[PDB]
Amino acid sequence: FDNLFDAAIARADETIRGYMGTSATITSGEQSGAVIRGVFDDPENISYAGQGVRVEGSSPSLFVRTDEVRQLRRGDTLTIGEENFWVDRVSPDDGGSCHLWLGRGVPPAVNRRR
Amino acid sequence: FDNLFDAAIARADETIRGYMGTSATITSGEQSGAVIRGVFDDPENISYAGQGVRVEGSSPSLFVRTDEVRQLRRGDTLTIGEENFWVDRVSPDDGGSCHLWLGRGVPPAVNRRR
Amino acid sequence: FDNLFDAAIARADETIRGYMGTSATITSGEQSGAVIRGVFDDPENISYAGQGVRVEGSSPSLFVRTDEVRQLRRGDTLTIGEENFWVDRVSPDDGGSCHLWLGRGVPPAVNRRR
Amino acid sequence: FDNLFDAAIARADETIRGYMGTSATITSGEQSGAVIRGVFDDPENISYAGQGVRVEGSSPSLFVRTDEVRQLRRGDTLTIGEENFWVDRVSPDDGGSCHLWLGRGVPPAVNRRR
Amino acid sequence: FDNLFDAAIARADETIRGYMGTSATITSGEQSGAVIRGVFDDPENISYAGQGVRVEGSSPSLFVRTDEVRQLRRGDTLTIGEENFWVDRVSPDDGGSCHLWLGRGVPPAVNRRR
Amino acid sequence: FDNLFDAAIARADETIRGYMGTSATITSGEQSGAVIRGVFDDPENISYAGQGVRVEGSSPSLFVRTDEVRQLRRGDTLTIGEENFWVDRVSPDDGGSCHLWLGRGVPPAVNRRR
Amino acid sequence: MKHTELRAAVLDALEKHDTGATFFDGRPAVFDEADFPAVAVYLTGAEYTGEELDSDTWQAELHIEVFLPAQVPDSELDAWMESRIYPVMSDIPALSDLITSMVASGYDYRRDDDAGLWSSADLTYVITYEM
Amino acid sequence: MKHTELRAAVLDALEKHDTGATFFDGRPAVFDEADFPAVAVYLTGAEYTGEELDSDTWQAELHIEVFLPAQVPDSELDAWMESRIYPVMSDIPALSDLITSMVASGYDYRRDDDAGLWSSADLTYVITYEM
Amino acid sequence: MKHTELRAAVLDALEKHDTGATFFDGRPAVFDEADFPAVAVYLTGAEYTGEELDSDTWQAELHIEVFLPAQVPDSELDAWMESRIYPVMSDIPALSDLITSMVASGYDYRRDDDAGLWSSADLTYVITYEM
Amino acid sequence: MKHTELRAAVLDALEKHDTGATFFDGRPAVFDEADFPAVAVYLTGAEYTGEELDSDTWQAELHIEVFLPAQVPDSELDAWMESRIYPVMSDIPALSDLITSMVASGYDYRRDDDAGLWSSADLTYVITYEM
Amino acid sequence: MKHTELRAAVLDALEKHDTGATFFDGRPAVFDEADFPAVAVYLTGAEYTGEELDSDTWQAELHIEVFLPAQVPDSELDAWMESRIYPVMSDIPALSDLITSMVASGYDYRRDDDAGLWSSADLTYVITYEM
Amino acid sequence: MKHTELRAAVLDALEKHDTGATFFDGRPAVFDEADFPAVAVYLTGAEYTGEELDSDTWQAELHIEVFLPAQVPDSELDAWMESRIYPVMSDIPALSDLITSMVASGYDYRRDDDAGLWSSADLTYVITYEM
């Protein structure tokens, strides 16, 4: 590691993930069968669509080490416990770990014409 | 439990509910006769509807364990002490416990055409 | 009481009212001759009605136990020290005590046609 | 005093005014020649009048016991050190002391037709 | 000094200026050749003027004792280290010291027609 | 140094850079072959351009001593680790160190007509 | 003419039909969840039309607003406006003396999403009288 | 006539074709990710036309709004709007009894960027009936 | 002409009737809950009409506005405008010398909900004079 | 007609020329810095024209919008709009079957200053077709 | 012609009468409590008229704005505006050389309630000149 | 035709006169206090005129904006806008080839009060060309 601080924070993040981690398995993607640990967070948000239409839901996310997620790409599908999630956006590398913003549906159809 | 922290927080929430929680009974719904403990919070709010209109009310809530509320669904009626409440929105599973946003009226008529 | 915490907080509020309380007498209303203690707070606000109009005043309130204010209703008149006040809004039951939002004028004329 | 707290706060306020006090003398008003102590504060504020105009000034205030300014009224003139001030607004009775919002000019002409 | 606090804060301010202050010399004005100490702070700010027009600059300031800048006026010129600054606005007397808001350009031409 | 505090803060910043620093090499510019240490921070930001268009990226920056960055100018190219960056804006001198706001692209074409 | 008379004349004939709802006369109206079906009548936006040379003429807008708890289905609100309030408001013998002309204007719905405490819907009229 | 039967008729004629969607009658409609393809029908902005001397005429706008998950492709909404809603809406035998005139108006797409939980698209109609 | 004279004339003709209210001349008016009714008179929005070739003509709006505490019923404000402010302003001998034409405009109500300390109601006039 | 076909035709006729840029179909377009040249095609604001008695007519606006990084010189953006996009869109054989009339409208630039991550430029067209 | 000599002429003709107030030439004017009256003069909103074929014509608005302390009585601002500024601005021999047409426009009052440090009132003119 | 050509043609003849100012071509322009008097030229709001049957016509607005430090006197900006820019911009021999019609529009001043770092003043033209 470049500095003392980088190694220290790597060990600290590893301990955090060990003590507060949930096992998640990727299903469809380049890492077809990897198993990854992370901290699972499911906060709440509600937005209104008009006069009365209220849409109630949640925005889950996952906190994983960036070394085992290098091959991961947007649109992949992974499972935690019983329910299934897909990867929405992968946060930039902070320290030694990065977030996996997730969605609870099936992946959307793609628009790109490549 | 997946982690040490999950078990620790489950025990902590159980102690919180034991030391600061009242008793509520469901009346109409899938859990017809269950009795559940929870922490009752009744903050107040007022919203105006014009120049000289002021609607005074409050938005109560209940804090319950998520395992014994699995069969609960929106629109059910439950009582605390003397007054009667219905269930508005059931918050996502946070840690080991979830909130029951309540209303003080009679349940409203349904719109769905199933 | 339902819990240990309710009794503890009731005693705490009683000590607060004992050590920082002002005696108030209700005059007109269902509780025609009660004498009530509470904490008196008189903060100030100013609002403008135009370019060169400033209306300067204060919005007082009273912190009282909810058991002896059960029969009190909006529009009643009570006095503290020398000045005279009337009840504007009675806050919902919080713990063991509720607020009495007051106004310094004579009561307004009623609009209801009952 | 009504409570222990009222007397305690009165003594604390008297100590504050003794240790951080400036002598001010009223000149024109019902209290024609009183001498009063208080804490003098002169913060800054600047406001813009359009594209480039920038009026720079300050909003002084004084912190006085409420029993000496009972006869004081808006528009009176008082002096602190060398410069002269007039009374703009007298804050309501908080605890045992009130504020004297001041202005640095001569008093304005009156509008009322009494 | 009127109070104990004024003397104490004056001594504390003098210590602050001694331990963290640079030296600035006035050049043109009523105090043509005075040398004054103060604390030099140079924060940044950027403001835009439309699509992409970004103006990068900073708003420097100085912190001096109010007794040695009595004759100072707006439009004066003073130097710190190597660069040259002019006085923009002289803050009101706070406690025992006042700020000197500075600009880094040549003084602007005056508009007054006296 | 002018004061005790300037020397103290210079040593503090030097220790900070030593313990949490990454080596960066300038490539194109007046300092063609310098090697520079600094602290690297890469936070995220997402902005939307319309109904669904979402642009996700990061805005990196580098914390560097100001004495060895005197000759560096906007538009120069420097590399950290493997990726390549260019200087966008150089923060004003704060204490003894300044920031280097970077961008991850190839430098843009110039507009000036000198 | 005297707005008090007009509001009283509307409310008297609006009360005879059994509705079991609290009626507020004038703009200031304060209530809570208990006495909730509440109908308030007020006049707003008076103006000097100056239509005729013979005598003064004014225009004012008459409002009948009903408040219902939030999340009530739209069907209930439709009913108050189209079954209870429209037939009574068409013909009032008392108004015939005071009002030279009374023209309907459309009603509209609004709900509170800030806190979800109330949902109201006001029927609007245009009143032309003499002052 | 009464708004209730009009929405009932349109929902009846809209349900017969298989869509597998939850239909909401009236303005209030609360749901979550489960029943996402919901379709809501409501009337808004009623007004007094004052067109014919014989009897009353009113104008109101009829809305049919469908909700789809955020980040669903645009082309999917196109199909839901045109292929499903437009053909059924042109001719409905039950409507012609109540509605004197029904005119189309353009549909529009709205997405949510504050939280990214929904994306809807509502077809608007203009209705002229008699009350 | 000189706005001082016009406001002085209006206030003189308005004070003779007993009202027991503090009267404020000009826009700057500061008060508290004691001296409450606080009728204030001011002129606003002067403008160059350019109506006649012979001499200058201007247009300005005359305001009479009364302040009353919040939550005071609507009907009581109605009274001030209908039974006190309006009858006096119809015929005032002093105005006829200065003002060539005075035309009424509708009074309007407003209440304060930010803090609930005041509720005013102004009566607007249009003045055409010579300067 | 079906918006899918029209966007498909435009993208087909626009891809043949070498541009080396990612092309997005419809409103949802999510991309990071790596795929920066990005061209998105979508339709917005359809309405019922009601121009001809024989059959239906609609009006919708066609959008072609390109994204380029912030601080790119304005000159470079000028080039995409005036050398790449304009010549190809003038004559496209596939469109002439579906569209009755196509009319140009002015392109316009916009830059992002809140974060400085993107700078787009869209070219607007007006489409009149049959549904 | 050039704006500089126009403002110079107005200020010269405005200074001769004793007023005892500072005068600011041009838009930037920074002052404190001591220099309270202020009396700034500036030009704004220039436009190309294109009224005559022979030569260039322009329109611009000439502002004369005076600053007085907050809570100063309204009547004082009136007296100031009319009595001092209007008579001098009507006829000025120096202006007639440069300005082809000068038209008045109404003055207006504005006060500061954010901080209560200033209250101003500007007289607006419309200038038609040749550049 | 090509906006690059038009901006280059303006700047070439705007540079020959000695001004000692940094000139920015195109919208993106970044600077600081050192290189301050800076003149930027850009084209905005292009639009399809559709004026003539024979060939295409477009309208674009030509901008010449000059930035000067805040609190600079107004009279100085007048000089920059009239004396230096307006005479040179009247007749550009190289311009007449590309532009069919060039019409002046008024300039205007704006200052920055958020932070006081810049004060700009832009001259606006209307350009009609062929594309």
Curated annotation (Swiss-Prot), chains A, B, C, D, E, F:
Function: Plays a role in virion assembly by joining the head and the tail at the last step of morphogenesis. Six FII proteins probably bind protein W that closes the DNA-filled capsid, as well as the U tail terminator protein of the pre-assembled tail.
Any one GO biological process: virion assembly
UniProt KW Aminoacyl-tRNA synthetase keyword: no
InterPro entries: Phage_Head-Tail_Connect_sf, Phage_tail_attach_FII
Native organism: Escherichia phage lambda (Bacteriophage lambda)
Subunit composition and interactions: May bind head-to-tail joining protein W and protein U.
Major localization class: virion
One Pfam family hit: Phage_attach
Subcellular location: Virion; Host cytoplasm
The protein, known as: Head-tail connector protein FII
Keyword terms, alphabetized: Host cytoplasm, Late protein, Viral capsid assembly, Viral release from host cell, Virion
One GO CC term on file: host cell cytoplasm
N-terminal signal peptide: none
UniProtKB/Swiss-Prot annotation, chains G, H, I, J, K, L:
Example GO biological process: viral tail assembly
Coiled-coil segments: none
Pfam families according to UniProt: Phage_tail_U
InterPro entries reported in the protein's UniProt record: GpU-like_sf (IPR038512), Phage_lambda_GpU-like (IPR009312), Phage_tail_protein-like_sf (IPR035934)
Any single Gene Ontology cellular-component annotation: virus tail
Subunit and interaction comment: Homohexamer. May bind to major tail protein V, and /or tape measure protein.
Compartments in which it is found: Virion; Host cytoplasm
Gene: U
Primary localization class, coarse: virion
Task of the protein: Plays an essential role in tail assembly by capping the rapidly polymerizing tail once it has reached its requisite length and serving as the interaction surface for the completion protein.
Family membership: Belongs to the lambda-like tail terminator protein family.
Key words of the record: Host cytoplasm, Late protein, Viral genome ejection through host cell envelope, Viral long flexible tail ejection system, Viral penetration into host cytoplasm, Viral release from host cell, Viral tail assembly, Viral tail protein, Virion, Virus entry into host cell
Protein name: Tail tube terminator protein
Naturally occurring in which organism (per UniProt): Escherichia phage lambda (Bacteriophage lambda)
Highest taxon in the source lineage: Viruses
